[PDB]
């Protein structure tokens, strides 16, 4: 009942914060070829469990800081 996204971590320097890269595949509106797009989302990770390279799940939540509105749920795969 809560919006979730699955991605891979690309940064862990910040305290209690991780940057995860989301990727999606869509068709070009005119030429019809399938294109891949990427989005970088800041998430909240209280215990710094995540690291660069793991596959994580995040869920939508209320704002925590200026740029963070998502929170970590679980780590699917480890690096």
């Amino acid at each position: 009942t809560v919006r979730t996204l699955t991605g891979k971590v690309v940064s862990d320097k910040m305290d209690k914060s991780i940057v995860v890269l989301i990727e999606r595949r869509v068709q070009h509106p005119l030429y019809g070829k399938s294109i891949r797009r990427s989005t970088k989302l800041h998430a909240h990770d209280e215990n710094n469990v995540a690291k660069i390279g793991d596959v994580v799940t995040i869920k939508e939540s209320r704002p925590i800081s200026k740029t963070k509105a998502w929170t970590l749920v679980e780590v699917v795969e480890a690096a």
Binding site: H28, Y31, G32, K33, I35
Partner: protein
Amino acid sequence: ATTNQLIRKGRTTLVEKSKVPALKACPQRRGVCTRVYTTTPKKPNSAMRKVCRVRLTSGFEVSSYIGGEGHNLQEHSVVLIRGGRVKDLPGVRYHTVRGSLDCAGVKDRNQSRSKYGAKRPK
């Protein structure tokens, strides 16, 4: 082109320029007659054709043909100009409206009167 080439760079369209820049997308313009005179046609035509250099409210100075036989225009007259080229006269891209502001309608004309601006004879 390939699909990848089209995605990276799409098709490009070239803009079109108007043939009557001095009108500035208006049906007619008003001007003050700066120089009335006559010119000679390009080959293979020979005549003496009446034109006038006019300064418009658009900030441009152009040349305009005078249609019909017999006109009363002179220096500093106020005239209305429309679009239309004269073809055999190079550089004349506009026409003067007959009988609008200071120009008068042609005389002794009974056909095509709405052009040249002649009223119905009594």
